[PDB]
From TrEMBL, chain B:
Keywords of the record: Cytoplasm
Keyword Ion transport: no
Single GO MF descriptor: Hsp90 protein binding
Chief location category: cytoplasm
Record bears the keyword Magnesium: no
Organism field: Kluyveromyces lactis (strain ATCC 8585 / CBS 2359 / DSM 70799 / NBRC 1267 / NRRL Y-1140 / WM37) (Yeast)
Protein's name according to its UniProt entry: KLLA0E16699p
Localization of this protein: Cytoplasm
Length: 7, 632
């Protein structure tokens, strides 16, 4: 559901 | 014997070390063989036979201890110093006579050099003088005493300088002498004389094209700025032409340690095209390739010269000309591989070029380098590779970074840049706090693949990986603590990996973790708070069993509501708390009855039933209707 991504 | 010798020099089909068996009897070999060599070497043979002779002589020479049995070799070697093809073999043979007889071998050499000088003086031609300087430049670094004494004698200086004045048109004499000057610079006393008596000669010889490279070499070693700049400009210019590759490459590799040389090199577009072409060329020597890679890595390095100029070079000459992509199909030794990794690292310091690096295969090159060194050398190069890998896995989609190969094979190396349980700790890799931060950013991206299942499987296969993550939950660094919580929130998209670490309330260690996590909801770092809230929201909205237990945890509910009352203006945090609270309130009507008379909670929910935020009005309505359920 909640996802952290840096790309 | 004598036939053994003919076999050793007859053809390349023979192994001299193997013939040792034929050289069984110590004397026969220690004598006849030496005598056969004395008689054989009294003439000059073809370079094939000479090569084999001076490839085998060192072996027997090293074993013999009687000097009177190897004394003849000094004249034989020094009289062949003008045969360029066997000069390195002659040096090894003389170095073999250094382990033993060191004192007697230097004294024999001086007596020969002194005899050679008298022959040069009496020779109307130039060949005797060339032989003397060639003997001196060959044996200088191992016979400094007698060679310094000869070079500094007035009788030697006199014949040398005079023949450089009268026979400037003799390139073999001049270039032989320029090599002597450069080799002899290994001695400080000699360097001072050259820097005090040869500057004029070197200024004249710098004007002749075929003397320029060796003159600039001597001028570099005699430097105690246009004197240096004209020398370097010759190295760059000569290298862009493609000639004297070994000398200019070795010279420019040491010279590119200075910023002013790098700027000059970076500004010469002609040599930069040539350096990339030579690296890509399948004809250049491995020794030249290494130097070419050293120069490029030195010139591509970001400082801690202007950054935008270095960034412009890396884009225009390394990335534009596909330097990285060609390194995949080139044979690299360990030291050249080290520079290739260094070049990749340098380019990735500009994040705009990382995507091009990955397309050219830089990811696979980092991975293979790391796997090859894993059980071998976790040295500074090993660390540098992980640094480049971290930065790569931060800015590109992981699934496209390793030629369709799983990006999760990178995980183990990233974990190496994370502090291990203090009980163990002590890691060869001297990773800094920034390295840990960057590895955690990269792992968080790896955790986005398949709801974190794939990275979770790696964490589950080694309890040391989870311990390292848990050890950073309360790190003193805000950015490390934030990135650790973000990593965990992605890993909570599937309960297999680490859900038991926080939500196994029958385990005291896990239950204490949960209490700590609850308290972290009120961290001062909003990014951290969003991630903590995401941790809870993710499993609560996905695992009904865990959701049921969470709905009975008074401290979690009171803390979430408290944070919601005071920070609901932050969209991401608000949405995450609403998902968590609606999940909890849908599972536990008695939790709803606790808050049904919270006036401030209700009014804050009512204001949001009115950006790209559709979940906020919907979840606010759902929660308010559940509170209405508890009233009607």
């Amino acid at each position: 559901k909640f996802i952290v991504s840096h790309y | 014997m004598n036939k053994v010798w003919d076999r050793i020099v007859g053809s390349d089909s023979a192994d001299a070390q193997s013939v040792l068996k034929e050289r069984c009897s110590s004397p026969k070999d220690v004598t006849d063989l030496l005598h056969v060599i004395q008689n054989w070497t009294s003439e000059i043979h073809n370079n094939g036979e000479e090569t084999r002779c001076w490839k085998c002589v060192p072996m027997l020479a090293g074993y013999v201890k009687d000097w009177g049995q190897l004394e003849f070799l000094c004249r034989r070697i020094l009289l062949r110093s003008s045969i360029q093809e066997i000069r390195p073999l002659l040096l090894v043979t003389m170095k073999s006579l250094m382990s033993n007889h060191s004192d007697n071998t230097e004294q024999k050499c001086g007596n020969i050099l002194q005899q050679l000088l008298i022959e040069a003086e009496e020779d109307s031609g130039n060949v005797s003088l060339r032989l003397l300087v060639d003997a001196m430049s060959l044996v200088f670094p191992i016979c400094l005493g007698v060679c310094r004494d000869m070079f500094l004698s007035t009788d030697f200086q006199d014949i040398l300088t005079r023949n450089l004045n009268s026979s400037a048109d003799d390139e073999h004499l001049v270039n032989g002498a320029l090599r002597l000057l450069a080799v002899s610079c290994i001695d400080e006393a000699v360097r001072r004389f050259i820097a005090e008596h040869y500057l004029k000669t070197l200024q004249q010889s710098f004007k002749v094209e075929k003397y320029k490279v060796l003159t600039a070499l001597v001028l570099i070693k005699i430097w105690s700025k246009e004197t240096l700049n004209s020398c370097i400009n010759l190295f760059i210019d000569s290298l862009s032409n493609g000639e004297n590759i070994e000398i200019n490459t070795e010279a420019l590799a040491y010279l590119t340690l200075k910023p002013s040389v790098r700027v000059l090199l970076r500004g010469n577009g002609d040599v930069c095209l040539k350096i990339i072409e030579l690296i890509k060329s399948q004809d250049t020597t491995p020794t030249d390739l290494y130097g070419l890679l050293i120069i490029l890595a030195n010139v591509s390095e970001h400082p801690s010269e202007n950054v935008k100029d270095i960034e412009e070079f890396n884009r225009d000459y390394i990335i534009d000309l596909d330097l990285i992509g060609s390194l995949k199909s080139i044979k690299l030794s360990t030291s050249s591989y080290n520079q290739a990794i260094r070049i990749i690292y340098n380019v990735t310091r500009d994040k705009t070029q990382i995507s091009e690096c990955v397309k050219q295969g830089a990811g696979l090159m980092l991975l293979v380098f790391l796997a090859q060194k894993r059980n071998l050398s976790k040295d500074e190069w090993y660390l540098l590779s992980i640094r480049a890998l971290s930065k790569t896995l931060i800015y590109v989609n992981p699934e496209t970074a390793f030629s369709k190969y799983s990006p999760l094979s990178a995980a183990p190396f990233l974990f190496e840049n994370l502090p291990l349980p203090n009980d163990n700790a002590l890691s060869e890799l001297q990773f800094t706090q920034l390295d840990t931060y960057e590895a955690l950013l990269a792992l968080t991206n790896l955790a986005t693949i398949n709801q974190g299942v794939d990275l979770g499987k790696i964490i589950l296969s080694n309890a040391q990986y989870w311990d390292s993550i848990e050890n950073l939950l309360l790190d003193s660094s805000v950015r490390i603590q934030r990135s650790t919580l973000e990593l965990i929130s992605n890993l909570m998209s599937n309960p297999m990996a680490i859900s038991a670490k926080f939500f196994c309330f029958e385990n005291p260690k896990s239950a204490q973790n949960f209490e700590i996590l609850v308290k972290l909801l009120e961290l001062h770092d909003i990014q951290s708070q969003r991630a903590v809230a995401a941790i809870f929201a993710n499993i609560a909205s996905t695992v009904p069993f865990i959701c049921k237990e969470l709905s009975e945890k008074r401290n979690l509910i009171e803390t979430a509501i408290r944070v919601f009352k005071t920070q609901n203006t932050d969209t991401d945090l608000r949405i995450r708390l609403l998902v968590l609270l609606s999940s909890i309130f849908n599972a536990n009507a008695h939790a709803v009855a606790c808050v049904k008379n919270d006036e401030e909670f209700v009014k804050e929910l009512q204001k949001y039933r009115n950006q790209k935020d559709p979940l906020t009005p919907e979840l606010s309505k759902e929660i308010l209707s559940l509170i209405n359920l508890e009233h009607h």
